[PDB]
């Protein structure tokens, strides 16, 4: 049914990285890409190619992971430690340029859709705008 596509993707990613894999797909969307467009440019991931799955257009998303640690649990650190949806379809979150977040005192990023396209916690403050606060990642 998918009452929330965006969230589905975020979770689609969250569930892959947790088990460590090279790439997981996700249904194509103009709005969906502009979101991944942020993660690439912010290095949160590698990239993605508008691949195709049985006539249906998906988006093979490529994940980065830290260096193979040693000792008990050699599994590497996460490039994307945490990601959760903010403005959900059951509750939209709208903030002005003065009410913008502050993920991990700068150490993180926040993605929001505004009247000037898909921006960042920063760009929003730089541009001087504000809109629906999508999520947070670090």
């Amino acid at each position: 049914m998918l009452t929330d596509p965006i969230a589905d993707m975020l979770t689609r990613i969250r569930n892959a990285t947790r088990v460590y894999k090279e790439s997981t797909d996700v249904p194509a969307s103009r709005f969906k890409e502009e979101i991944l467009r942020i993660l690439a440019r912010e290095g949160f991931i590698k990239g993605y190619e508008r691949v195709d799955v049985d006539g249906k257009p998906y988006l093979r998303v490529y994940l980065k992971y830290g260096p193979r640690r040693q000792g008990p649990d050699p599994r590497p650190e996460q490039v994307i430690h945490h990601i959760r949806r903010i403005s959900k379809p059951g509750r939209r979150v709208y903030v002005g340029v003065k009410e913008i977040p502050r993920v991990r005192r700068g150490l993180g990023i926040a993605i929001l859709s505004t009247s000037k396209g898909v921006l960042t916690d920063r760009e929003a403050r730089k541009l001087g705008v504000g809109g629906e606060l999508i999520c947070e990642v670090w």
Partner: protein, 151 residues
């Protein structure tokens, strides 16, 4: 060089035919105030032995406590079992604001000023083990970007 400091001691009790026997629990914190702390829990038939073997274990466990001038680099929280701890970084002149458990750990790691609260379970033992993970999961602006460059 290292500064030991046990913040929890107790007397458990097992039971056997006629009466009940006792072991002793020792929760000790070790550090240097440079940004290196360790936590170890020591059980032993008597008090000292535990305390002594607490610091033994407490030195076996350490940490990369990155200090941005007596504080931590970012805002972190960690859930261990049913217990929860909140570390929010504070500007100098504030001081350590926390229960008698967590402050004992932040001191031996330096930390001049920080804001915290204990949520959920207040059990020190689980609060302790909960605090180390928090620190063991701090990342400076440096530790971060490295990752976000890849290859």
């Amino acid at each position: 060089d290292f500064e030991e400091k046990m913040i929890l001691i107790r007397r458990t009790a097992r039971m056997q035919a006629g009466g009940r026997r006792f072991r002793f629990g020792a929760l000790v914190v070790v550090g240097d105030r440079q940004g290196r702390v360790g936590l170890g829990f020591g059980k032993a038939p008597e008090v000292p032995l535990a305390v002594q073997k607490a610091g033994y274990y407490a030195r076996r466990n350490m940490v990369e406590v990155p200090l941005q001038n007596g504080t931590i680099p970012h805002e972190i929280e960690v859930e261990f079992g049913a217990s929860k701890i909140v570390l929010k970084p504070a500007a100098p002149g504030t001081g350590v604001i926390a229960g008698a458990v967590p402050r004992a750990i932040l001191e031996l790691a330096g930390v001049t000023d920080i804001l915290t609260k204990e949520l959920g379970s207040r059990n020190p033992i689980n609060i302790a083990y909960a605090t180390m993970e928090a620190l063991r999961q701090l990342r400076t602006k440096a530790d971060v970007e490295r990752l976000r460059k890849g290859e």
